[PDB]
Amino acid sequence: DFTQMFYNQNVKQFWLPEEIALNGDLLTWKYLGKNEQDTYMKVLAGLTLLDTEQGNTGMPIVAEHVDGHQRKAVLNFMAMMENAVHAKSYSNIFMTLAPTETINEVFEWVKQNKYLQKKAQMIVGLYKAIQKDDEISLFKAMVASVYLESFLFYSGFYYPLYFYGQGKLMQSGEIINLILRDEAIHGVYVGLLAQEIYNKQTEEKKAELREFAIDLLNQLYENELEYTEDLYDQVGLSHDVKKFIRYNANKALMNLGFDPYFEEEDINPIVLNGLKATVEPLKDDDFYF
Amino acid sequence: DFTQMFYNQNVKQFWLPEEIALNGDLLTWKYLGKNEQDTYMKVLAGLTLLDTEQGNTGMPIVAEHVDGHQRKAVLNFMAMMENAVHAKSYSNIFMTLAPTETINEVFEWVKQNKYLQKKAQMIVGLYKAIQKDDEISLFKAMVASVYLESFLFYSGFYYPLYFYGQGKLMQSGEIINLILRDEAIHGVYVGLLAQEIYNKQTEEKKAELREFAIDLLNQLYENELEYTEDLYDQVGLSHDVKKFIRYNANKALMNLGFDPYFEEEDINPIVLNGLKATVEPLKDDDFYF
Amino acid sequence: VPKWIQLNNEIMIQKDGKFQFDKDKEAVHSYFVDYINQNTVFFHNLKEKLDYLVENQYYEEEFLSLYSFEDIKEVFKTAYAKKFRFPSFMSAFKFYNDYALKTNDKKKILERYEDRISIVALFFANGDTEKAKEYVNLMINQEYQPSTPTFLNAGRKRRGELVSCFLLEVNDSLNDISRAIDISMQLSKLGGGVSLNLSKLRAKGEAIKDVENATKGVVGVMKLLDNAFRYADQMGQRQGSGAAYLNIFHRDINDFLDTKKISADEDVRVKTLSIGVVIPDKFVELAREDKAAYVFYPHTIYKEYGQHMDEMDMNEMYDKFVDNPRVKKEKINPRKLLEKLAMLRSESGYPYIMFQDNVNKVHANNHISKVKFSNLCSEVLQASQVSSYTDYDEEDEIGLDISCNLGSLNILNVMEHKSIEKTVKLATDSLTHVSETTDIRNAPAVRRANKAMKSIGLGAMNLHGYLAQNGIAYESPEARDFANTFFMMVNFYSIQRSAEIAKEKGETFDQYEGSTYATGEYFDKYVSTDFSPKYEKIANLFEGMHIPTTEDWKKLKAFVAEHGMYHSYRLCIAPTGSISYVQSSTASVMPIMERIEERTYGNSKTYYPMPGLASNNWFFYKEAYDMDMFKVVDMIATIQQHIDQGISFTLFLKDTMTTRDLNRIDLYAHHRGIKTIYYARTK
Amino acid sequence: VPKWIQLNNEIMIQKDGKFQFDKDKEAVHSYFVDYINQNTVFFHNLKEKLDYLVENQYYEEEFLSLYSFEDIKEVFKTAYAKKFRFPSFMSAFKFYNDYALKTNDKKKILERYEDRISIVALFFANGDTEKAKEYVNLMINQEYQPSTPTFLNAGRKRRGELVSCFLLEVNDSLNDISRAIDISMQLSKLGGGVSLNLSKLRAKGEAIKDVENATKGVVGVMKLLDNAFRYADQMGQRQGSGAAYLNIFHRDINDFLDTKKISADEDVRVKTLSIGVVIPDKFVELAREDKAAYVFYPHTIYKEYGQHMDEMDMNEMYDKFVDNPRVKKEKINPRKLLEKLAMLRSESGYPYIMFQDNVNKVHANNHISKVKFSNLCSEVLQASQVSSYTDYDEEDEIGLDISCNLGSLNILNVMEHKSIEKTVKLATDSLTHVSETTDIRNAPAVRRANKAMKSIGLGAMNLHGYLAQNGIAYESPEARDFANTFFMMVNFYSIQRSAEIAKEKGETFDQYEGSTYATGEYFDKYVSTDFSPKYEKIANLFEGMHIPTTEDWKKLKAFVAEHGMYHSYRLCIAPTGSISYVQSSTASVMPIMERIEERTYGNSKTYYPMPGLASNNWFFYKEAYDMDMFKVVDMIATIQQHIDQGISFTLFLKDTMTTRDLNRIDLYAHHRGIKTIYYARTK
Numbered sequence A, B: 001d002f003t004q005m006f007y008n009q010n011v012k013q014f015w016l017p018e019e020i021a022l023n024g025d026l027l028t029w030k031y032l033g034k035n036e037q038d039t040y041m042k043v044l045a046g047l048t049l050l051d052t053e054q055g056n057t058g059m060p061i062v063a064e065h066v067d068g069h070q071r072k073a074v075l076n077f078m079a080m081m082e083n084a085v086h087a088k089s090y091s092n093i094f095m096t097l098a099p100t101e102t103i104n105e106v107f108e109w110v111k112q113n114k115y116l117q118k119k120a121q122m123i124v125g126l127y128k129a130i131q132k133d134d135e136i137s138l139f140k141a142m143v144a145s146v147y148l149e150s151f152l153f154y155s156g157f158y159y160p161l162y163f164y165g166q167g168k169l170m171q172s173g174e175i176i177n178l179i180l181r182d183e184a185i186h187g188v189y190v191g192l193l194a195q196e197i198y199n200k201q202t203e204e205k206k207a208e209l210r211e212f213a214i215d216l217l218n219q220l221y222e223n224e225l226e227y228t229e230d231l232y233d234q235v236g237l238s239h240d241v242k243k244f245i246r247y248n249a250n251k252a253l254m255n256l257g258f259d260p261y262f263e264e265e266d267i268n269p270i271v272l273n274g275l276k277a278t279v280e281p282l283k284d285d286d287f288y289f
Numbered sequence C, D: 001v002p003k004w005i006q007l008n009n010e011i012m013i014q015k016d017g018k019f020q021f022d023k024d025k026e027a028v029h030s031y032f033v034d035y036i037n038q039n040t041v042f043f044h045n046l047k048e049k050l051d052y053l054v055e056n057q058y059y060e061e062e063f064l065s066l067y068s069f070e071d072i073k074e075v076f077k078t079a080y081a082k083k084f085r086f087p088s089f090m091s092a093f094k095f096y097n098d099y100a101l102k103t104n105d106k107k108k109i110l111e112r113y114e115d116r117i118s119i120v121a122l123f124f125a126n127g128d129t130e131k132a133k134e135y136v137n138l139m140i141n142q143e144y145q146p147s148t149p150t151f152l153n154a155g156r157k158r159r160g161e162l163v164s165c166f167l168l169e170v171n172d173s174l175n176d177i178s179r180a181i182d183i184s185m186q187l188s189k190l191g192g193g194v195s196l197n198l199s200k201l202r203a204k205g206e207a208i209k210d211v212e213n214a215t216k217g218v219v220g221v222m223k224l225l226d227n228a229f230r231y232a233d234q235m236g237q238r239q240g241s242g243a244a245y246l247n248i249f250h251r252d253i254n255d256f257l258d259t260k261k262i263s264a265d266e267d268v269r270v271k272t273l274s275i276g277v278v279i280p281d282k283f284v285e286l287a288r289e290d291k292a293a294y295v296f297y298p299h300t301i302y303k304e305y306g307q308h309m310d311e312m313d314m315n316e317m318y319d320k321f322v323d324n325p326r327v328k329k330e331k332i333n334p335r336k337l338l339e340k341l342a343m344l345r346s347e348s349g350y351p352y353i354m355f356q357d358n359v360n361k362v363h364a365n366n367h368i369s370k371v372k373f374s375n376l377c378s379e380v381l382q383a384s385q386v387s388s389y390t391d392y393d394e395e396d397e398i399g400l401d402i403s404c405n406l407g408s409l410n411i412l413n414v415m416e417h418k419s420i421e422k423t424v425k426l427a428t429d430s431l432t433h434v435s436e437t438t439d440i441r442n443a444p445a446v447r448r449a450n451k452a453m454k455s456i457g458l459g460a461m462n463l464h465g466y467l468a469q470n471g472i473a474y475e476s477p478e479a480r481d482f483a484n485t486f487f488m489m490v491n492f493y494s495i496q497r498s499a500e501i502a503k504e505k506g507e508t509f510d511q512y513e514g515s516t517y518a519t520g521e522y523f524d525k526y527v528s529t530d531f532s533p534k535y536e537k538i539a540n541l542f543e544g545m546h547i548p549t550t551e552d553w554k555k556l557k558a559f560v561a562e563h564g565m566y567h568s569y570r571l572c573i574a575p576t577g578s579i580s581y582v583q584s585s586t587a588s589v590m591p592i593m594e595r596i597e598e599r600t601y602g603n604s605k606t607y608y609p610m611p612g613l614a615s616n617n618w619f620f621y622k623e624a625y626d627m628d629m630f631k632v633v634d635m636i637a638t639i640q641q642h643i644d645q646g647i648s649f650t651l652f653l654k655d656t657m658t659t660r661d662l663n664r665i666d667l668y669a670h671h672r673g674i675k676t677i678y679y680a681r682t683k
Ligand SMILES: Nc1ncnc2c1ncn2[C@@H]1O[C@H](COP(=O)(O)OP(=O)(O)OP(=O)(O)O)[C@@H](O)[C@H]1O
Pocket: C028, C029, C032, C033, C037, C084, C085, C086, C087, C092
């Protein structure tokens, strides 16, 4: 009942980072403190890693196991967006704002950062555990994918949105909003596929799947807290970002058909402001008048 | 040396089925004989069936085994074009020209056809034989992929190009020309990835891979001749189609860095009408000797 | 936003369900109260103004020296006594942005409308103060409008040539091709639009010095010409505009046409080179009977017969070409070629269509040459002789290259003043003066044909404006009756003025004795058919003016026989792009495209209603796209029967109609005697 | 696959760890016993062959009519008495595919090597049987090789022009630009490579008669020339090749260079027109001192001083240009421009580099004009005077456009026969004959310069072949000593032959009296410095030949002072691309690119070993890319000190080295006196 409308929405949302000129951010970037620039680079690098794996691994593997040519076409399109559009856009931002050495250093930093490695290990592990014709392993990977789309990106998205909302780094911010618009529909779509599998189960099996989903969310959440503190303490925003990730965790649960898990909190209003002609042949009667 | 350049060319060639209005083809379709309509339907179904294998298996399997983030992104983009763009385009052409019952029957016929099946299963067999961390099996699959993209499609493309060059079925011919333009670049790109593997091999292993490629080409070519007579004798075109197959076989070989196998031939004119060194600053004292 | 621009944009704001057309008038006042008068340089007297303009190299000394200062002052006073006021903001804006003389720094206005008109009149009269005053009264009444080159550049030292339509014949040689490129560059440097005939050039795959498959065809020549026109772009002011014409029986015709396809590669497509196709009656007969046609290799025909393919009548030569084994040809489907022409015109408006036999069955100078091609605007249709440009230190054989002199009658202003005869004769005299004062030292055949043929083009404009302001639909039979009568009178008085000039100067145009004017054949339809209006309304429109009868035409025929005719060609209806704004007139004899046109200048929007548009005549100002193209063809043929050259005839199509409808319009134009079809503008 | 193809491929199949070079010889035998002898056309005697070639428009009958048939028979017998055998398969293949005369359908071979040599000798001798036999002995011994145009086209009816390269000066005017385009098309039609100096053309943003920012600069003319060369492509056989040269002080120099950038847009990119940059010593001085330089607008300089920017010495006028407010200029970084040159040469091998001061400090004809640009191969360096092509019906001021005839000495064969003097004199006579019989009717400046300058180019080939076959490393000081002595001998005997021709004809070249030959300055270094070999091995190599001393040079200087010189320019070392195959010689004086070259012909692949390559001289045949470019520069400078024109000096670079290494090589070449640098070929 939904794939065709998601197909149409995904293809109509198609974009490339080159559509957005980035040289306009040069001055507001220059004006940020060293702490702010550091957090910003690292935040986008963490996002780049997530999209790299979502494009290389997550979306293609889910596409492989989901039945139906139209469902596969949507998932293939989403996969392309992840690595050919989203992951690449971050390099466009980096290449504009930062010198090569700072770019090299931040990519080295992703490799050695323990929270980023842990979250990649956990998510990709679940993708690679999918067994052919085994719907339960597929469900588990789809939960992981929804958590990546609708929860994990948000510790990263906070900061570009926070600046956009203050009228700073607005070209980079425009790119990020386009990425976010895509991930929102990706999270809903994968959520609907996960619910399909969940709804086939016995009540006992469903109870176990909810346990899996909640245990996984809590494990990812605890790691994300440490990641958030590590990045945001130097810019004074860790508590604010934490509220934002809890907000989005609830959206991820809802995408999976589950009740919200965290209590509602006031999000920084700045971040909320951050959001040919037809051809006929000639007849013999057309030559006479 | 080449992936970013191909990335650029691929994304700038992006298109959607909806861009070409198909209904005006009915004004020339109605004037074709039964044999012409039959051949066209059968050719179209042949292309559709082969392209589906490439979208569901060929491109995604190669993307899975190739190392490199940028290569995986380009390959993902190509897989997207197969599943999201090409497959919808073929379906659109069919739905415009034939009623539902006729489409189902043509696909039943072509699905049972000996020559279409022989080539489809030969290609799919090589994709299924790729082994993790074995570059030889990957190379063999890449050869199969290049043969599909740059050679096997062309016994089929001939007919729409033949009409397109005569002013008949111009809307569907425009679509086919866009598809063909994508397959050409797909073949060239996968060809470069195959040459990379080939160049890492010993001289004895190279000679062995050359023998594999020529042997495979021979098997496919002999089946193409039979496929060609089966479809085109009823419309009197087989002689010229055979010249077009050999010409495209030579292009496929050149994509794989191999010499042409067949002597140069002229092609049907109607179908033709259808168709950095390291910068180092001067340090002074370089002006004195 | 300036005040006049607000007053102009207030037109679209509807009061009582009606457009505020009168507000436009207020805008003009503002445009003169706030801008024009503030930025207009004023002098204590006209003597100081003329001295400043001459000394600062704005004007020419020669044309002003022919008059005493008292005569020049009297001419200026006659111009200013009319107290002419621009009725619409766009008229004054277009004049003071395109034609009014400005300082070298382009911030001050040196010339008003009256000043420019007086200067052009003094240039026209060539020393006659009374003739200058007559020209001033003609142009300040806005009865006659010199073309943009003449109007803009007359009397100015820093100027281009007064002629901007040039037709070149290119012979089949590398020397001739290089000379054609050079002449095209020189004429684009002068500011003129250059049309080149490429039919004599041998097709692709022909022999050069008996080596086979050597010629690049006409497409390589088109690439060279396109580069030449891109290079020569009026000193970086306007985009270099050129046209290439090829006969439809030339073998390159497809590749020619392929230069305008969007799918064409960069080495095939020419972007700044317009293309036109010459279609003889033989091609239309072949398409009509569905017989497969043949496109011929021109060099083989030249070798076999000693003449170029486009130099002989294809109607009698086609069968001999086909049956000749020594003539190389390729099989084509003429109906497929017609469909390709219609599709290309739908996509881009190209090519221009020239119906060769429609032009040449009424051509008066077929003895000199048959009309083989048209100009960049597809309205100049004259005899041309190719030139043989030989090697260096060898004498060239200079032929005839067409360059006619443009000028348009304002039909509304001419007919409301009841001055068809006087306006036509004065316009003919001015065109003769401009043709005589034109001397191009880098185009030998253009200069020779200007000296010999003395061909001028006297056009008309504001036909639809006049008809709409008189309660006449453009597609009505009454409109065609009026066009017939008006243009027959225009032709009569143009021929009379040409014969009078020939009698006064004692000379006719070269090879006049062989023309149909000399033999009296041209006047046949005029001495047997009465062209008086058949409707009472049109006759009342022509009240107060003598309509030439058959006896008057017989007298004119006898006068031409006794005295000859000075001009080989007299009448051609040009598009009249920007001068129609200044004259507050509809463009050419074409129907209006829009009732109110929206334009963007700088970062500001402006609104131009069609002249005289109101609630009463809103329905009569029917848009061209809403009109039946068959009736537009009928009107254009009615006018064309009285025009010796062609008419710039743009087709106005809706996006709904297909290439079959375009082909039907083209074939009905061919049937009705339409000589040229200019553009296929799709709404 | 053919038998000879298999035998040639058998070379790379190693036997006992060594290449089978002798198999190559077998291939030639096969190539003759299976293809050439079967595909040759034999006649009963020479009379029938000559008659068939004359009546069938293969040969010109005029040059053969100067000899009785007995004399022609004697010449052909002299050619065939040598029993010449091609030592390699590729030599015979290249001759019989590129230079042997074939039938109209190219199915049979009409000319053998001896037949071609006899015809060329008979054309050279111009009626002298003994001179024809001397030429036959010179060419069959392969001591001298006429250039590809001369060797291929001599005595042929369907021939082109015998001149290889043409150099045109383009004046700053639309008439001159159009004439340059026409002449470029005419000379490319004749088959010659055309070089155009664009330094006189005013830069982008200059005024065309008081309207500013109007010119398109040299890039628009570059696009026009590129399209002209694309159109005139030797009837589609060989791609039209053109060269554009611009002074580095031209304002457009960056845009010029941007024509060759791989990222250039289509409206700027030029792909069939080679680019060269002329660098005065002032630019190198500014880059060395890191002082910001100024590029200049040529038209402002011409207005202020009355002369073109490239018409005067920049080393003395640069400060005056900079301090002159009436001269317009733009600031540039000369070191950044040098780095851009190095990057462009790394990416595409362009531009050609012409060190203007290095050319003009030893130029013998500076009185006529300074050398402002080079040819398409960057080895022709001659005085040129720009032409003033005026309007039509106005007389043109015809200047001097450079054109010289090429001919190469085979160093190995010349020194083996101990005949430097005889070969040089006979080659000078043949080049003089080629110049005398050259008459181009569409390039007036080229014709006038050919008639007046009488310039010829006598090159040399097989320098590396001779050095490697004699156990001398190309980079060794012994090789440079040999080059010094050999080319001093060549210069001595070329000057002697030029003076003897001037004496026998009683005429010198135009304006010889102001040259350094007339004043005796040219002989200064030759009358004070001894150029005899400093190494015993080289002296032994020169045994049996009289090496000129300072006394012989003094006698030659006196002889020149008494009689003058017939040729303004005598020696120029062309690349000698494909004719070096036939002579079994290494290309020009350049070191070999590879020991064995694998070339693909048809569907087959062939391997050509370097001439004389074997086990004992494998390492003496060092590849150019493996060589130190500084020592190659030293060799080229040593040769250049005895060559009046330039040498086509290709740089052979490795991929590992940076643009800084390329800049260092260029600056060392400038320091060592290198006149021109041809190509930057990267391995
Ligand atoms: N519609 C218009 N077209 C042309 N010029 C105009 C127009 N309106 C104003 N002008 C110019 O501005 C001047 C002022 O005209 P205005 O309407 O104020 O009254 P006037 O009685 O014509 O004035 P004046 O004393 O200048 O003749 C005119 O003389 C004329 O030069």
